[PDB]
């Protein structure tokens with residue numbers, strides 16, 4: 001059955017400024033991921049060419065409490081639209097060994113995004 005993972009959108013947290021907590025979400029097809037505007041100024045947006053095959057792009061409204069249903073297996077790198085350069089990202093992994101994760105890891109993106117991404121991958125391993 002579908003399960004839900006809550007994600008807080010924060011001005012600052014464990015990893016520094018402009019964070020999603022958690023920044024790693026392990027899910028399966030049909031689960032939901034709920035993004036909560038704990039602090040103002042944030043949203044969630046799928047990153048270009050960093051969501052799985054067959055998945056639809058998405059972009060929430062600033063300060064919206066946005067419930068995403070994930071169905072397509074693979075990895076999703078999401079950003080906060082204004083705060084991408086500051087590192088405000090999260091990785092959603094749907095199913096095991098997400099096929100596009102290595103591609104996402106190799107893709108052009110800011111150094112701080114790369115650092116935060118690599119950290120959550122290492123923590124999940």
Ligand SMILES: [Cu+2]
Nearest residue numbers: 041042080083
């Ligand atoms: Cu933000």
